[PDB]
Amino acid sequence: GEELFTGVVPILVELDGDVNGHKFSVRGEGEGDATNGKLTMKFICTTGKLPVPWPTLVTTLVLCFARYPDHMKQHDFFKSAMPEGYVQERTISFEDDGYYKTRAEVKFEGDTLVNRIELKGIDFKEDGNILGHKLEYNFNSHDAYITADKQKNGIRSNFKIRLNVEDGSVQLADHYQQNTPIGDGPVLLPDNHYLSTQNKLSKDPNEKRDHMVLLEFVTASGI
């Protein structure tokens, strides 16, 4: 638990990406309410058209806002690392297609929780579901198993995401994640547990740019 999260906290997300040579940038702003595990964001592609589908970026674009209920009485690694924060890295593999590599730093800059990301995408098919924009504009609910990484004083998670394809099939995006603390402050390593996430994606009717409006709920649970 952390006193930095008892109220509503402004959020800034900055992503620089390069997928098969197609460079782009995303900036998001919003706020987070860890007491209810809730966040609300609006993201904008500041370089023009986004060359990948927005649902492929949801997981990359702040787990410190999860709600850890009292009855679990579990250590919250993500908040205990704050204000200095942590590095979050992922490989994301798309079935029968290319993959993302991401490195992000999540930390306070002033009163704002910042998620600053570098993303690189490799070996995508120019008319697969990703570069061909064949994915539905939505996002399913999922659970992710969190385990302690004692040797790196951090955590790991491997989890799958089912992405809805416009032909009615699903395409799996398998995620492989590591988080390590920034600085040398003491952090709480948790026992194994789950984070449960639900998302709602929408559009702003007065927004001309390529954008995504996002509502997300994150709750710890399990075992």
Question: Which string of b and e fits 24-50 if b means at least 16 CB within 10 Å?
Answer: bebebebbbbbeebbbbbbbbbebeeb
Neighbouring CB atoms inside 10 A of 122's CB total: 12
Strand, coil or helix: 203 = coil
> Can you say whether residue 183 is alpha, beta or left, with left for phi > 0 and alpha for psi between -120 and 50 degrees?
left
* Residue 116 CA to its chain's centroid (Å): 11
Model resolution, angstroms: 2.2
**Residue in 131, 110, 111 with CA at minimum distance from that of residue 121:** 131
Identify the CATH number of the domain in which residue 196 sits: 2.40.155.10
Residue 187: domain span: 3-221
Q: Evaluate whether 213 touches 97 at the Cβ level (below 8 Å).
A: no
Question: Which string of b and e fits 169-180 if b means at least 16 CB within 10 Å?
Answer: eebebebebbbe
Distance CA 33, CA 37 (A): 6
**Residue in 198, 188, 195, 199 with CA at minimum distance from that of residue 222:** 195
Q: Radius of gyration over alpha carbons of the chain, in Å?
A: 17
Distance CA 41, CA 28 (A): 6
Neighbouring CB atoms inside 10 A of 160's CB total: 13
Q: Evaluate whether 13 touches 109 at the Cβ level (below 8 Å).
A: no
- Residues contacting 59, CB < 8 A, separation 6+: 90, 92, 161, 173, 175
What experimental approach yielded this model? X-ray
- Residues contacting 166, CB < 8 A, separation 6+: 134, 135, 136
Report the number of distinct structural domains present in the chain: 1
